[PDB]
Design a binder for this molecule. Structure first.
Ligand code: 9JU
Ligand code: OLC
Ligand code: OLC
Ligand code: OLA
Length: 449
């Protein structure tokens, strides 16, 4: 067995550079993750959701790693940690376990999203707060079984020893890398289908946009003012009679409907309504030059305002209408927010204003906080695969050919990428997830007062 002093590679002032770097990154990583743990455990809305308990497990795995990895690195490489066989095996085992549980935590987070977006009503019956905690229990245990295997007697006694890690053999190293490669393929396969479904949820039409705002109904209904209406906001009559509304319906369709229409018949009526909206805008002196400047997505947002308050009402935002034409999306957003339209109907106005600001369909989606979480996980997975790749690629090269002293020096500094990855994650979750964003605002109220 080769002594631990042979792996202790450092060259004077270059060791003091890692001593300040590893300490500062390790302190920042631990403080960023412990905030994410507090925020989830403190907020009533988060702790009860099985989706946020998997995120919490990633924050725990990253926090335990940050502390173990930095204290074991600065002790081994900088201060020269003369550790005995038993003490060293549990240290290397603790490092492996806290890292394996992160990959595991991600895999469960990716299957949680697939079941939610693929089978929506069956998810509440399947994933429960208790059932999630049990599933998180099996994972942490399996992680400890795989990682603590050299401590059980799988060390390099007659078998060839590894280049980078003391006491661990190449047959174990190859087995752990192959296991991690299979977990990554499993995450990729699921996230491949997750994207496909998450995409089918967001609107890509005016019909799909106005379905969220007006509400598609195939039987006669009453609006906020009380008028008899059908389909996607199609007005039947201005009188209080149902028979008058029924007669107007049979004339509009061309057959005896009896108060019930087909989806294809509802879309045919909607296409006649859109044509009349656009022809109206063209014959309005104020609305015509604005419709001409706006793009296809933004035009659908102005048609939406016409369906809600008519042509005479939309022409009343003289200062906003000019800001929109001049392509000053930011100055018009604040100008339209100070309107009574925003005061009366906040949700409809907020969704319309954001479309005029971004030029996307992103505000219009069924289960949008569930779709946006699937969008956040994808960015977390991408950063993981970027940061771990050079570290993993060197370990695979470690099995193929004998490594030089200078290459071993590169790996010590290279492994610092595992510490930046853990620092990038709590910034993404605090900037993209709205539920983590609002939980931090409600917690600061109790901290200050
Ligand atoms: C970057 C890294 C390390 C790592 O640097 N471990 C050290 C363990 C110990 C000796 C020495 C200095 C300090 C204390 C860190 C190496 N350990 N692992 C766990 C995999 C080892 C498998 C053999 O048991 C990693 C690592 C983390 C993420 C992906 C790939 C490797
Ligand atoms: C086979 C034994 C497994 C036992 C499985 C445990 C049964 C699940 C119990 C359950 O449904 O409780 C969850 C609770 O609603 C959370 O708040
Ligand atoms: C595909 C995504 C790449 C990210 C996954 C990381 C791929 C690195 C695995 C590896 O080390 O294999 C390369 C080659 O076999 C050794 O020279
Ligand atoms: C030290 C290891 C800490 C990790 C323990 C995680 C167990 C939580 C899931 C079981 C309920």
């Amino acid at each position: 067995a080769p002594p631990m002093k042979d792996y202790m590679i450092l060259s004077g002032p270059q060791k003091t550079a890692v001593a300040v770097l590893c300490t500062l990154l390790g302190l920042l990583s631990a403080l960023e993750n412990v905030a994410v743990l507090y925020l989830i455990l403190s907020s009533h809305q988060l702790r009860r959701k099985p989706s946020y308990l998997f995120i919490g497990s990633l924050a725990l795995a990253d926090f335990l790693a940050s502390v173990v990895f930095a204290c074991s690195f600065v002790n081994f490489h900088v201060f020269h940690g003369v550790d005995s066989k038993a003490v060293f095996l549990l240290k290397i085992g603790s490092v492996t376990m806290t890292f394996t549980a992160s990959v595991g935590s991600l895999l469960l987070a990716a299957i949680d999203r697939y079941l939610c977006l693929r089978y929506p009503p069956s998810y509440k019956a399947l994933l429960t707060r208790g059932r999630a905690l049990v599933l998180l229990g099996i994972m942490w245990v399996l992680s400890a079984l795989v990682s603590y295997l050299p401590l059980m007697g799988w060390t390099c006694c007659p078998r060839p020893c590894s280049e980078l890690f003391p006491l661990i053999p190449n047959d174990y190293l190859l087995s752990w890398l192959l296991f991690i490669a299979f977990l990554f393929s499993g995450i990729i396969y699921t996230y491949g289908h997750v994207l496909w479904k998450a995409h089918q949820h967001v609107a890509s039409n005016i019909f799909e946009m106005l379905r969220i705002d007006e509400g598609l109904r195939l039987k006669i209904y009453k609006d906020t003012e009380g008028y008899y209406t059908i389909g996607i906001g199609h007005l039947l009559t201005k009188s209080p009679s149902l028979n008058a509304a029924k007669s107007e319906l049979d004339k509009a369709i061309g057959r005896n409907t009896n108060g019930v229409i087909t989806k294809d018949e509802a879309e045919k009526l909607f296409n006649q309504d859109v044509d009349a909206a656009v022809r109206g805008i063209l014959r309005n002196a104020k609305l015509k030059p604005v419709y001409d400047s706006l793009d296809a997505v933004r035009r659908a947002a102005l048609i939406n305002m016409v369906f809600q308050m008519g042509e005479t009402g939309v022409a009343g935002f003289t200062n906003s209408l000019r800001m929109l034409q001049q392509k000053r999306w930011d100055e018009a957003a604040v100008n339209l927010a100070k309107s009574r339209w925003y005061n009366q109907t906040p949700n409809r106005a907020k969704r319309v204003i954001t479309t005029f600001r971004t030029g996307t369909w992103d505000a219009y989606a069924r289960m949008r906080l569930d779709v946006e979480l699937a969008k956040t996980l994808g960015l977390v997975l991408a950063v993981l695969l970027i940061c771990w790749f050079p570290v993993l690629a060197l370990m695979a090269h470690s099995l193929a050919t004998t490594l030089s002293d200078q290459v071993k020096k590169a790996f010590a500094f290279c492994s610092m990428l595992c510490l930046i990855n853990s620092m990038v994650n709590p910034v993404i979750y605090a900037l993209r997830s709205e539920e983590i964003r609002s939980s931090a605002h409600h917690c600061l109220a109790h901290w200050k007062k």
